[PDB]
Design a binder for these strands. Structure first.
Ligand code: ZN
Ligand code: ZN
Length: 1107
DNA sequence: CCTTAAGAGAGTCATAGTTACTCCCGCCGTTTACCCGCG
DNA sequence: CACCTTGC
RNA sequence: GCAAGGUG
DNA sequence: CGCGGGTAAACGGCGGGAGTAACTATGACTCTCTTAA
């Protein structure tokens, strides 16, 4: 139980031990340190409100106004939680927000108007049968003699006056009539097969290649390829496959180096388990810690089930090889034709090198066991690479030897018992890295060649998920505002990349537009595709892939998108989607996942028939469970959700979303009621912080893991979800408290130290409330200036600009600085324009679009830190210094204890009577030891005597280090040279190292950077008091030249430039100069820590050991 | 061997904006179904 | 240069 | 493992 | 049948308006002061 601590409780007896520790803060200290784990909550006796945060209860203590628990009355208690309310206002508003499902139910119920007493109650007892018979007879009795006869009586219980009344209802002098209509759905995209011959000229690329090779041979161009293979191919050879495979084998053997052999370099006590855990974690931190970060944050490991290889085999054998007869795509047509000129260009080793650069070097090598690193080692020039690549390309016969690839099962689930199934293993297929690179090259060529529909936002340059999500949210809000019904249908097909039959993609490509050369090339690429299933100590014998694009091959994305395009096309051909403005946007698309946006339930039905047809042609399998959907319907005031019937996707009730229900989409939690469900950020954040806290991750390591791995995870959702500043502030507060506890910093520490970057001296901790707004604004602008004019139009009419302005302000950007969202952005190329034209487009880099930023915040915290009187004294020295801050990131050798107190000293908040005095006025501050008014930290430095000997020993120790280095640099030692100046008094300088005839007078000193002129005053004193001298040393050392410079140092470790001038006068190379400055600074800081330690001993440990 | 000084953030409640509608809503105008004598 | 997302 | 995007 | 004028009652169309639970965001204050492998 959370032990009830009904504050005020002065010094209570800690119930976990019943020990009177002290003030409630002292009780905290107790429970936190020794008696943790046990539950405890401070109670606010008056209101009895309880909080695990003492501070908060103290905040009550004045604030709290008694027993504030009484609940206001009323006469509308909202059914579910019976929250009494003043009026219906409060009631159905509680429905609206707190209890919105029943609210939708009420909305719909009242929605059914069924009002109609517009008739005015004039209605009477007429019968429709009598009305129809009267109408027919009057048609028969049109003003023709003996007109009533039947009318008067055959309508029993009526009068001619009543007949006149009814005629006055319909026809006045006569009867009347009515009419009706009916709509229909749309289908039949399953016709008109188009393939007749080669889409592009059979030799269109072949003829170009022949011409280019002729030009090269005549002019000896730089295009690389084996001569004989191309000679035979031009010669119309029959066994070209044989020869091309032979050359392949030879060149690959060149790349199949002898890859370097692995060069990677009672009795029952639980201590072994803890030591192994600590060892594992420390090693992973030393080694790759991405694995460590996953293990910690996810709380997981690596899994390898032992499911009978026989089974696993049967499954995948029957899956990959299993085929389905592709009938065709009927009328399904995609975007448009594809240009072939993009391929006319021949391969350039420059381009291949380029592509190589854009590779995951850290990738497991294929069966060849050859890596991109290995590959480059073989040919860092891509000369032979272009050679054999062109060999194949021009020939068109990819070697079958390289085809063999390795397959991997990914333990999708976490629970072992779930893992037992085969459904928790996404199969990864990895082939020859050479094959991978060639594939990506051709893939880039194709992607340029074949244009996809804009609506597919997957696997392209545009920023995908953000665009889709923002568009969806907008659309929803826009619709609700516009008071117009709308239907939403999520779709998801299984085995997106796996069920695909090679034959159908063959077909698809046939009509797109492509030279038969590349056609056959791709076929061969996907022809004779064997692989083995790597598992533990066994890889299954070969399996011939006949269905499913090779999982891992760079092509698979492009090919899949290509096969899917026809669907998107046909859907737009329906042009029955939501008529946003002019555009009738039908559906969005990302990779495989897609939606459907019609305007009427029946329009959506039409869409579904189209989809069903598509599956029929493709033989694809969609399911209601695999899919979700929901409908919107406007009211007089608000919108109703799902008011209509659930659909019948694949003849199955599409699972509908109801208010409050959320279904994941691109990692989000789309809720029709509120668009995106508010993400559970605090919960995941706290969980992660707990996991980190409770591990062998010595504090510095905790901070490193945090800043470098944890934050991005939360960044993604926080930014992608419109998040308000207050919640971010709360999260930042949580993080600050947690880290401060981690490193046992004093509570009141200034934030600026925490937030400022390590390079600037700070802890480099993110400030979500300051960072997320900038990311959000960047996304906003990025989407605004998109290529899809539709997306633009949408955002524009959705007046995103106001949000952009507001964010830019919120992130801290100035109103004037607000860029005009319409204007273009900076388009860099990482290449001098000259070099840019020098090369070809295929070798051109990717022009990433630089975007504005509202402001820099790290600098903001830095500035505020500077402004601080106490915690911010002398720090400005450390701004934009790449030397002093270094140890923060590479505090090697420092003891964790030393390092932590080093943080404190750097912050000037170390325990000292002044520090204990700081803030709290009424106290004593006199330096215990000497007399200093404030028992400050600087008086220690020099003023405070007791040290004396230690100060001297440290000083001459540093002098000794520099001396030791001196002889190493052939600087003749003439240090500690007792002198006798004009006063014949000992002015022994630190160092007078002589060389040739130059004698280098030096003055080693280390001063705390209290003021700004510290070191320049030092130097002025150096020269000033030294001055004269000259002659005496001139003859003593027999030197013809004498220096007088100094060597001041920052006590904290600040490295002035004067010592640097000494270094350059010494002749040290620049790189060694930086190395020396860094190391020397760390030594300075360490010996300062020693000074501290000593003093702290002096009096404290003196009393402890000697009472 | 060197320096003058000495809150800073944690935290709660108060109050104003503002969302999101929703509620609604009352008042005047329209529509309905008859209601009545005549060529 | 390290991380993160999604989606296979 | 692959394709993109983002972040310091 | 034709053939006019009356009917007066929902509702809906429209001006507006009026309110509001519950977030979101500043403002104004007060309390806080010791544990490294
Ligand atoms: Zn209270
Ligand atoms: Zn002193």
């Amino acid at each position: 139980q959370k032990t009830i601590i009904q504050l005020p409780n002065d010094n209570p007896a800690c119930p976990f031990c019943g020990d009177h520790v002290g003030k409630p803060s002292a009780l905290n200290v107790h429970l936190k340190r020794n008696h943790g784990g046990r539950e405890v909550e401070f109670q606010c006796s008056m209101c009895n409100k309880a909080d695990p945060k003492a501070h908060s209860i103290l905040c009550h203590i004045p604030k709290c106004k008694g027993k504030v628990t009484e609940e206001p009355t009323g006469d509308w208690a909202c059914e579910t939680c019976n929250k009494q309310f003043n009026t219906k206002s409060g009631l159905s508003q509680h429905k609206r927000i707190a209890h919105p499902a029943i609210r939708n139910q009420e909305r719909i119920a009242a929605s059914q108007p069924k009002p109609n007493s517009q008739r005015g109650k004039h209605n009477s007892c007429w019968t429709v049968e009598e009305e129809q018979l009267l109408a027919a007879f009057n048609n028969m009795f049109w003003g023709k003699k003996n007109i009533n006869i039947l009318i008067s009586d055959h309508i029993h219980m009526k009068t001619a006056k009543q007949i006149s009344e009814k005629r006055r209802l319909l026809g006045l002098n006569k009867n009347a009539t009515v009419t009706t209509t009916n709509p229909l759905p749309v289908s039949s995209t399953c016709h008109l097969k188009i393939r007749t011959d080669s889409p592009n000229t059979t030799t269109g690329l072949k003829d170009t290649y022949m011409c280019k090779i002729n030009e090269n041979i005549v002019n000896q161009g730089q295009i690389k390829f084996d001569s004989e293979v191309i000679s035979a191919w031009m010669a119309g050879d029959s066994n070209i496959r044989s020869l091309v495979e032979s050359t392949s084998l030879d060149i690959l053997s060149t790349f199949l180096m002898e890859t370097p052999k692995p060069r990677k370099k009672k009795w029952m006590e639980k201590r072994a388990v803890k030591k192994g855990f600590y060892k594992r974690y420390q090693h992973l931190f030393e080694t790759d810690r991405c694995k460590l970060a996953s293990i910690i944050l996810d709380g997981t490991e690596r899994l390898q089930c032992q499911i009978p290889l026989t089974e696993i085999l049967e499954t995948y054998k029957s899956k990959w090889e299993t085929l389905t007869p592709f009938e065709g795509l009927g009328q399904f047509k995609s975007h448009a034709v594809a240009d072939n000129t993009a391929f006319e260009i021949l391969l350039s080793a420059k381009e291949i090198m380029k592509n190589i650069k854009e590779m995951n070097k850290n990738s497991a090598p294929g069966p060849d066991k050859v890596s991109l690193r290995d590959l480059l080692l073989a040919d860092p020039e891509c000369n032979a690479l272009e050679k054999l690549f062109n060999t194949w390309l021009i020939t068109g016969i990819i070697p079958n030897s390289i085809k063999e690839c390795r397959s991997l099962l990914i333990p999708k689930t976490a629970d072992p018992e779930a893992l037992k199934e085969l459904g928790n293993w996404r199969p990864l297929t990895i082939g020859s890295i050479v094959l991978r690179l060639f594939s990506r090259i051709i893939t880039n060529r194709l992607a340029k060649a074949c244009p996809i529909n804009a609506r597919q936002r997957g696997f392209i340059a545009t920023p995908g998920c953000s665009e889709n999500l923002k568009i969806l949210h907008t659309i929803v809000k826009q619709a609700k505002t516009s008071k117009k019904s709308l239907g939403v249908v999520f779709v998801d097909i299984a085995k997106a990349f796996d069920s695909v039959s090679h034959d159908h993609i063959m077909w698809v490509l046939q009509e797109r537009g492509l030279d038969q050369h590349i056609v056959n090339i791709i076929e061969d690429s996907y022809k004779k595709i064997h692989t083995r299933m790597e598992v533990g100590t066994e890889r299954t014998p070969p399996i011939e892939i006949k269905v499913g694009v090779k999982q891992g091959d760079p092509m698979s994305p492009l090919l899949f998108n290509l096969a899917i395009d026809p669907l998107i096309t046909a859907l737009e051909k329906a042009n029955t989607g939501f008529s946003y403005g002019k555009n009738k946007i039908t559906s969005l698309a990302f990779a495989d996942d897609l939606v459907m946006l019609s305007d009427t339930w029946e329009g959506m039905n039409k869409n579904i028939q189209i989809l069903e047809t598509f599956c029929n042609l493709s033989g694809l399998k969609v399911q209601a469970k695999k899919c979700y959907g929901f409908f919107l319907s406007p009211t007089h005031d608000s919108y109703t959700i799902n008011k209509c019937d659930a659909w019948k996707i694949d003849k199955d009730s599409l699972n509908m979303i109801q208010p409050g229900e959320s279904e994941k989409y691109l990692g989000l939690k789309v809720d029709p009621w509120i668009g995106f469900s508010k993400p559970v950020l605090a919960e995941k954040l706290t969980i992660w912080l707990k996991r980190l806290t409770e591990a062998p991750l010595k504090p510095s390591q905790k901070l490193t893991m945090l800043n470098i791995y944890t934050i991005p995870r939360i960044i993604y959702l926080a930014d992608h979800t419109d998040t308000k500043k207050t919640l971010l502030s709360s999260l930042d507060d949580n993080i600050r408290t947690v880290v401060k506890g981690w490193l046992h910093l004093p509570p009141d520490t200034c934030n600026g130290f925490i937030y400022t970057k390590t390079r600037d001296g700070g802890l480099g901790v993110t400030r979500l409330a300051s960072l997320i707004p900038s990311i959000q604004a960047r996304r906003l602008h990025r989407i605004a200036t998109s290529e899809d004019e539709t997306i633009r139009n949408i955002a524009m009419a959705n007046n995103i600009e106001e949000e952009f302005q507001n964010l830019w302000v919120t992130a801290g950007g100035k109103k004037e600085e607000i860029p005009r969202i319409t204007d273009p952005v900076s388009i860099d190329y990482r290449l001098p324009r000259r070099i840019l034209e020098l090369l070809n487009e295929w070798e051109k880099p990717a022009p990433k679009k630089m975007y504005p930023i509202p402001c820099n915040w790290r600098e903001a915290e830095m500035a505020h830190w500077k402004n601080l009187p106490c915690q911010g004294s002398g720090i400005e020295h450390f701004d934009n210094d790449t030397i002093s801050n270094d140890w923060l990131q590479f505090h090697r050798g420092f003891s964790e204890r030393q390092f932590l107190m080093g943080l404190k000293i750097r912050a000037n908040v170390y325990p000292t009577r002044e520090y204990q005095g700081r803030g709290r006025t009424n106290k004593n501050v006199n330096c215990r030891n000497c007399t200093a008014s404030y028992e400050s930290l600087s008086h220690i430095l020099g003023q405070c005597p007791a040290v004396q000997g230690a100060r001297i020993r440290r000083h001459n120790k540093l002098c000794s280090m520099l001396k030791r280095e001196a002889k190493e640099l052939k600087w003749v030692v003439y240090e500690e040279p007792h002198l006798h100046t004009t006063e014949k008094e000992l002015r022994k300088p630190d160092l007078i190292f002589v060389k040739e005839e130059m004698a280098l007078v030096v003055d080693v000193t280390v001063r705390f950077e209290y003021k700004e002129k510290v070191f320049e005053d030092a130097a002025a004193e150096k020269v000033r008091h030294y001055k004269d001298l000259t002659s005496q040393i001139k003859e003593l050392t027999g030197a013809k030249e004498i220096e007088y410079f100094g060597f001041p140092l920052g006590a904290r470790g600040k490295w002035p430039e004067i010592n640097e001038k000494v270094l350059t006068a010494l002749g040290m190379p620049d790189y060694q100069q930086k190395r020396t400055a860094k190391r020397f600074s760390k030594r300075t800081l360490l010996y300062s820590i020693d000074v501290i330690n000593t003093f702290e001993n002096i009096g404290k440990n003196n009393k402890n050991n000697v009472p």
